[PDB]
Chains A and B, each alone.
Chain A
């Protein structure tokens, strides 16, 4: 029952996302990035999306998004649309990384699962686990510079080599990532974020829109 924060940002009752970035450096370039600041009560309610609208873009049945939503608490579930910034020449040898940070009032051990889905079928999943560090008066979870699956490096190289932005978007329309952060002991879904992608129409710069999943 700590809802006010979760109506206004990417957070459940027990975990709040500080940062998420995927990047490439030899120096640095952000493909996608989210950064939340401290929630104010006066911040707007996030827009809501009915979850049944995205089920066919993630795995279904046993290990699936629908099942997950039915179980872990419903205020844990979010949808992020990214407009990715693929305009970098650093790729033409370098490090590809994803970094994220979460805060909580509880001291837990968490696992973060990120799963690549192609046409709703799951392809690859990286699972990281992180212990808590106390700071100010909360617990901080910091998953720093984890390398990106070779699947994604290859995908990004080919995505970038397409001649027309409509083709990029056709490739991206059936490409999704599902992030699930779980408490390792009680295995209670702390956060679940469904990612969907387009390429940014700017020549440089990445954008995002954050929705809260419902019903």
Chain B
């Protein structure tokens, strides 16, 4: 996990790509041939 300190808090990121891509991977899976 990637680790970042920002504005008094610690953020752990669990994925290697870009954030925009992360959000898209969720959306595309949720909407793939939905009814």
Chain A interface (Cβ within 8 Å of chain B)? 118-119, 121-128, 146-147, 149-151, 154-155, 158, 166-167, 170-171, 173-175
Contact A151 B19, beta carbon cutoff 8 Å: yes
* Contact residues in A for B9 (Cβ distance below 8 Å): 126-128, 146
In the bound complex, CA of A121 to CA of B14 (Å): 9
Partner of B10, one of A121, A127, A154: A127
Contact B26 A175, beta carbon cutoff 8 Å: yes
In the bound complex, CA of A128 to CA of B5 (Å): 11
Number of interface residues of B (CB under 8 A): 21
Chain B interface (Cβ within 8 Å of chain A)? 7-15, 19-20, 22-27, 29-31, 34
Contact A149 B23, beta carbon cutoff 8 Å: no
Q: Least Cβ distance of B10 to chain A in Å?
A: 5
In the bound complex, CA of A166 to CA of B25 (Å): 19
Contact B31 A158, beta carbon cutoff 8 Å: no
Q: Least Cβ distance of A78 to chain B in Å?
A: 23
A-B pairs with beta carbons under 8 Å apart, 26 shown: A119-B26, A122-B14, A123-B14, A123-B22, A124-B11, A124-B12, A124-B14, A125-B11, A126-B9, A128-B9, A146-B7, A146-B9, A147-B7, A150-B19, A151-B19, A155-B23, A155-B26, A158-B27, A166-B34, A167-B31, A170-B30, A170-B31, A171-B30, A173-B30, A174-B26, A174-B29
